């Protein structure tokens, strides 16, 4: 039973190129790299031969293989990328089976009710030392599977719990005061509530829009103003900005600007419409997708692994050169990068509990109707996991990546295969190190990272996560930003215009009757390190120019001071890229008597202007709720309850229940577990270049080994 | 006929044969090679050719014929390089007009018996006709020039020589100018320390067996107006010395507290520095893999089997819509020109000469081995002349094409340096991306060019990285690698007596090694002809300002804009969180907006920042280098203008770079500009880089700031 070779593959997902001289078939998915000729009665996969029964079949130019041809090559075994999982380990996500069991307890309440909607159905994570000892001494974990699973009731958030083990709820709490965060169904219901609205289409009308059918809706959160807004605290809302659907692909660049709808969600109806003056809609089609434009030629480049990869995937679990981590993902926050520990010469030693996005924020500066209450919290409002955007493969990430599916709940509780959810991907990164002494043979050696990369698209933006593995023991942390800007409808055609200079008091002209409103992305990352243990303490290192006190004739040397930082308080700073920033282990040295370290960077560069801190005022509500926006580094106490720098219920939120709460008693980070939170941002001033789709834009962290290995930490293994 | 493997192994090609499909794939630079044993016909770059002779199988070995590797690689199929029928007048000398040069003033009666070439280089023609050849393909109508600068034991001549009419224009004594350091310098210092018996004498109380396994190291010895001893008229270099144990790195055995002082003109020892007797350090500490074993790792290829992207006709590379000139300077390495942007159809001038300016490495460390250590690594050693070529495959990716490239040496004899310059494209992440909610999505891939050169001056590597990106940005990319400079010392660990004073001016490393404190600056001379010649410095500043409009919000964001109008004011700081724009105010994009690069001298790094310069400002050498204390500098532009830390920055007792540039205070009102560059680290060292440092980068990049009407990468209309 034949089926076509091309088409059968290209549906499967794999990479196919014919070489007519050599009469050969390479086939490339993920870890498998495979040799085929017509008529071979073996095939060649990661450099192994394989016995097919029936060979690929080549008829007028049109090749046929079997239809078991997919599943005894690639699935052979000779691809060793995947292994199977020995013992399940504690932090793997909710299964599909879980899941579905999870949503069947809470079911079993009298409470529940078939309007209730899940904002988040995620493992309730066992306790960290037993996670440890099932990581390095393999101890099981006798604590019962959990489930935290947070309900929306209408408008009220209720937390239960439930146990896997035996079937059973635990418990079920009502949130008093908390709103959830914006479901999926919230956008279909907005869209409806503007369609069926009489005064909405007639606002609409006299905007210049003639079929009211044509208007694209979206929704954000209104944040709090203490009331200046006129919008009760307790009720269910979002606001509504449009966009006239012209056909070309891009509604986000025909604005309809001055004029925002208020929705109700439990009343499913329009509350309140805010209007302002009428802007003509800008019209002009602007794709972005390449219909209007030409392709050009290009020469393929390939990056081709032919003997397979150098990690290992056994269930989540990824291993490295020295490296070995957990990868799991969660409808929130996506990846989460668990258990790192570095392989020193035989001994796996500690250096990351759990990463992982804290949150972000992108708030705008322009104080208009349409405009003076956006702030996308876009993990915590809109569920950034669950927005993952799948790879698209070679293009997204490079064409010797390894593309991961993963499982969520979605909002009804129902499980959700999320298709090439993630990156993985070695990658040559220049020389690790060289010296070329004079007159000497060189010595360089090559630089290899193992990258890990999702992105996540909220509406118009569209964000990159990459975790980047060095093998010399440094971490990278890096956001991208790319997609399509949030732009403001007006007048001025250009600079020369009337209106120009009010038109673009809080943003570029970045094309004709649109300007690129002004704003900042502050991303944060939660990383809770254990750098070779649990008890650790900040060190600050200042260096400082001061006197020449030893004689000769310099008047200054360059020195350090040198200090510990002792509590959460003082560890909230600014970062000065100048200083260095460690936390140490005061309890384990390297070889020369230096506390083995990490040096903790949240500002390694970017490419757009680089966000000092908040852009407001401090006296502006959006910078009360939200304090992480002005420091870059925070160092709070381990604790399991404390992951979100933005606060666990944000939407709405009247003071800050994030970092400003974890931080507040001022505790001692004195020889103890810490978690470190690395803030860094952009200021965004648009220009030109930006339209009609941005350019990715990149902002780099990191965290380097400081005296934690006691030389050269990529020499090789000793051979005396 | 003639053994394949061993033959395309002399020619530099990688050979790969894979036994499944019968199939020799061989590669080199440009060339992708695809040839069966037996087959009429061979695969060059996607095209086929017709062989004369057929790869033969002989004892499972491969033979070709003797004329293969010309038929296969020569034949016209690799289009990588083509050839330059017109020669771009900004293409270096060539060795002939090297040797034509050298023979034009050994022929003057002032012409010294030993006289030495610390630089010969292209006297280049003027900018305009440089670009209207470039855009215009007009001759420039000037005869080929040279400049020749001698060193007459230590007196400084320059010479202008004019090579096609072969005759000598100038010759000018430059009273005062020490020269740079010359590759015989450092054996001549080597010869004068083994033949001293006083430094037998110190080497030997410092615990040193045999004398003959001392290694000097000479460095220039600064400016302290008299306060180190030294006298100002005096070629002098200052000798730092490691013992040689045998474990290939002297570098790890410092022999502390001792200096010696040699005149090259006397050719002797003229001063000896003593200070406490610190023991060597001993232990071997090999950097090469000599006791190493690496572990066993899949290949990974980048492979380009129809070839490049990129032409490179003679020194000119195209690539999409970038074209610009490559050339080399023995002083400060590669020099890219006339660089321009095909915008639809359009050249338009985007830069008409960037390279490295100059860089400085600064120690901060009082004692008598390092108060005075301070490497200009260009100006004073001449890093163009000690490029490293490129190890391919890890220096650079392995689908790299190395450039050979060619320089006069110290005695004037022309230098072929092999692999002196890697060009490569790379994947670097997504151009673009949008996903649609429930539509189908749009993602490009992002592809750089990148130019890479390395030189390497004693301890230390550098690598240069200018990087092309498709969108119109321009990145400059530094990366630092090699051997710490440190001082031997008593402590082992941070638990003996002696291990804070040890440890006061730097990190301790290794038993008894401390790596002192440095920083590491270097700075980029680019001048920027943005959509012309005729441009502005522009700041925006974003701020926060009071809400005036109505509304719940307080505070707004705003930009602060204003023009800087002269050279001082331009000489500045950079706060990242600022924007910095050379604009061209006669030029503007379809929204009215000027046409405009920004300028972002620090955008990210991998070891810690330097704010300026780490020295007190009545430091000599603060004084003597203003370039290292501000990271942005804008000077009208000047033909001899050329170098941050000036021409003749050994022992100078002035700023002849940067701050006499900066002077005047000119005006910078729509004009031809200059911007300057200048980007730090701070190093404390941890033992992570010791025996050998993991390579650190510094990032800094260009971007079109209205340049453009849209993405420019949407590709064309239809
Ligand atoms: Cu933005
Ligand atoms: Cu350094
Ligand atoms: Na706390
Ligand atoms: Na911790
Ligand atoms: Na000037
Ligand atoms: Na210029």
């Known amino acids: 039973h034949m089926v076509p070779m091309d088409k059968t593959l ?55 293989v079997s239809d078991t041809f997919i599943n005894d090559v690639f699935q052979s075994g000779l691809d060793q990328t995947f292994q199977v999982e020995k013992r399940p380990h504690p932090l793997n996500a909710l299964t599909a089976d879980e899941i579905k069991q999870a949503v069947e307890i809470v079911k079993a309440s009298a409470d529940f009710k078939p309007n209730t909607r899940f904002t988040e159905i995620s493992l ?14 393999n101890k099981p974990v006798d604590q019962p599977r959990k489930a935290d699973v947070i309900m929306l009731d209408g408008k009220h958030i209720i937390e239960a719990v439930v146990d896997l ?25 907005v869209q409806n509530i503007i ?27 209104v944040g709090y103003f203490d009331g200046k807004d006129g919008l009760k605290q307790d009720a269910r809302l979002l606001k509504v900005i449009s966009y006239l659907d012209v056909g070309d692909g891009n509604y986000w660049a025909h604005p309809i600007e001055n004029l925002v709808a208020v929705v109700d969600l439990e009343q499913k109806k329009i509350v309140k419409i805010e209007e302002g003056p009428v802007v003509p809609v800008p019209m002009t089609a602007r794709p972005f997708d390449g219909r209007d434009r030409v392709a050009p030629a290009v020469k393929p480049m390939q990056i081709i692994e032919p003997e397979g990869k150098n990690y290992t995937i056994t269930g989540d679990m990824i291993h490295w050169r020295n490296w070995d981590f957990h990868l799991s993902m969660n409808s929130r926050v996506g990846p989460m990068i668990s258990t790192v520990t570095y392989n020193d ?17 992108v708030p705008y500066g322009d104080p208009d109707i349409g405009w003076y209450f956006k702030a996308y919290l876009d993990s915590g409002d809109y569920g950034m996991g669950t927005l993952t ?87 990278g942390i890096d956001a991208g930003a790319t997609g399509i800007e949030a732009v403001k409808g007006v007048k001025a055609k250009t600079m020369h215009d009337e209106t120009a200079k009010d038109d673009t008091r809080y943003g570029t002209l970045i094309d004709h009757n649109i300007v690129g409103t002004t704003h900042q992305h502050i991303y944060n990352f939660r990383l809770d390190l254990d750098v070779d243990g649990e008890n650790n303490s900040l060190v600050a290192m200042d260096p400082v120019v001061k006197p020449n006190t030893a004689g000769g004739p310099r008047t200054s040397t360059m020195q350090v001071n040198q200090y510990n930082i002792g509590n959460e308080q003082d560890a909230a700073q600014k970062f000065d890229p100048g200083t260095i920033r460690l936390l140490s282990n005061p309890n384990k040295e390297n070889r020369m008597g230096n506390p083995v370290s990490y040096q903790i960077i949240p500002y390694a560069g970017g490419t757009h202007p680089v966000a000092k801190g908040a852009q407001f005022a401090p006296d502006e509500w959006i910078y009360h709720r939200l304090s992480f926006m002005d ?46 939170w690395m803030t860094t941002g952009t200021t965004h001033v648009a220009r030109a270049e930006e339209w009609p789709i941005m350019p990715t834009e990149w902002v780099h962290t990191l965290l380097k080994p400081w005296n934690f290995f006691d030389e050269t930490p990529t020499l090789g293994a000793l051979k005396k």
Not at 395 to 415: C, H, R
């Open 10 to 64: 290209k549906e499967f997902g794999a990479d196919v190129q014919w070489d007519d001289y050599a009469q050969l078939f390479t086939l490339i998915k993920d870890g498998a790299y495979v040799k085929v000729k017509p008529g071979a009665q073996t095939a060649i996969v990661n450099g192994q031969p394989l016995a097919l029964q029936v060979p690929v079949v080549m008829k007028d130019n049109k090749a046929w």
């Open 124 to 137: 309730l994570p066992p306790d960290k030392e037993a996670v440890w000892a099932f990581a390095l001494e």
């Open 165 to 189: 083990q035996n079937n059973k709820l635990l418990s079920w709490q009502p949130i008093k005061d908390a709103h959830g965060m914006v479901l999926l169904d919230d956008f279909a219901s």
């Open 195 to 221: 369609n069926n609205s009489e005064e909405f289409a007639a606002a609409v009308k006299k905007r210049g829009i003639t079929d009211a059918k044509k208007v694209i809706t979206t929704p954000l959160t």
């Open 345 to 361: 010469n035989g001994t796996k030693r500690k250096v990351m509990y759990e990463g992982s996005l804290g949150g972000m924020i």
């Open 389 to 475: 955007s799948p790879i698209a493969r070679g293009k997204d990430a490079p064409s010797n990546a390894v593309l991961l599916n993963e499982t969520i709940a979605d909002y009804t509780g129902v499980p959700m295969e999320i298709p090439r959810a993630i990156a993985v991907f070695e990658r040559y990164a220049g020389p690790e190190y060289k010296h070329q002494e004079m007159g000497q043979p060189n010595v360089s050696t090559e630089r290899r990272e193992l990258v890990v990369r999702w992105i996540s698209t909220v509406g118009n933006y569209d964000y990159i996560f990459d975790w980047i593995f060095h093998e010399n023991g440094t971490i």
């Open 631 to 676: 420091k870059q580094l925070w160092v709070t106490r381990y604790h399991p309850g404390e992951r979100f720098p933005e606060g666990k219920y944000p939407n709405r939120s009247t003071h800050d229940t994030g970092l400003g709460q974890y931080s507040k008693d001022n505790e001692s980070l004195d020889n103890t577990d810490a978690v470190v």
